[PDB]
Amino acid sequence: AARRRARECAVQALYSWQLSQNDIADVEYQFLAEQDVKDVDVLYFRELLAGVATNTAYLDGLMKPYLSRLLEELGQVEKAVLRIALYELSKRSDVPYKVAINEAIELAKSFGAEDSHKFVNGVLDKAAPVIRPN
RNA sequence: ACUGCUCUUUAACAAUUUAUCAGAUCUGUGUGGGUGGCGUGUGGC
């Protein structure tokens, strides 16, 4: 509710970030200004704002040859969701493959484009090597 | 400590009923166009 789902409490921010292209600090500023969210540990809020570090590219660079399609064609919602889910394990190292990927599959159902989970799960099998000591 | 372990490689068609051989006008700036009603009073004839 609070710890894990925290991600999907602020993927909006990510989305808006990946659409606004402004200062991420002001991004979280306007986001917390939008509503008082209590299903998120503010430490995970700081993680989400830390999810700006350039390895973002690298994590899509992680799958850059491991892609079924192009990158920009992956919608901004999928872009942000997958980018933060890989920011868990590509630079932040929060949890193993099963836990974080169950998260990335369950907490994108109220945002996906009616089929997002199939492709994110089929391409996220790259999450197995990124933590090989699974 | 003590709600939280993969669901498995992206949108997912409406179009529809004789019938066919396709079957000259692109003007104006000539110009009229850019204080009274009523009442009362007075006086006159």
UniProtKB/TrEMBL annotation:
<dbReference type="InterPro" id="IPR011605">
    <property type="entry name" value="NusB_fam"/>
</dbReference>
<dbReference type="Pfam" id="PF01029">
    <property type="entry name" value="NusB"/>
</dbReference>
<comment type="similarity">
    <text>Belongs to the NusB family.</text>
</comment>
<keyword id="KW-0694">RNA-binding</keyword>
<keyword id="KW-0805">Transcription regulation</keyword>
<feature type="domain" description="NusB/RsmB/TIM44">
    <location>
        <begin position="4"/>
        <end position="128"/>
    </location>
</feature>
<dbReference type="InterPro" id="IPR035926">
    <property type="entry name" value="NusB-like_sf"/>
</dbReference>
<dbReference type="InterPro" id="IPR006027">
    <property type="entry name" value="NusB_RsmB_TIM44"/>
</dbReference>
<dbReference type="GO" id="GO:0003723">
    <property type="term" value="F:RNA binding"/>
</dbReference>
<dbReference type="GO" id="GO:0031564">
    <property type="term" value="P:transcription antitermination"/>
</dbReference>
<protein>
    <recommendedName>
        <fullName>Transcription antitermination protein NusB</fullName>
    </recommendedName>
</protein>
<dbReference type="GO" id="GO:0006353">
    <property type="term" value="P:DNA-templated transcription termination"/>
</dbReference>
<keyword id="KW-0804">Transcription</keyword>
<comment type="function">
    <text>Involved in transcription antitermination. Required for transcription of ribosomal RNA (rRNA) genes. Binds specifically to the boxA antiterminator sequence of the ribosomal RNA (rrn) operons.</text>
</comment>
<keyword id="KW-0889">Transcription antitermination</keyword>
<dbReference type="GO" id="GO:0005829">
    <property type="term" value="C:cytosol"/>
</dbReference>
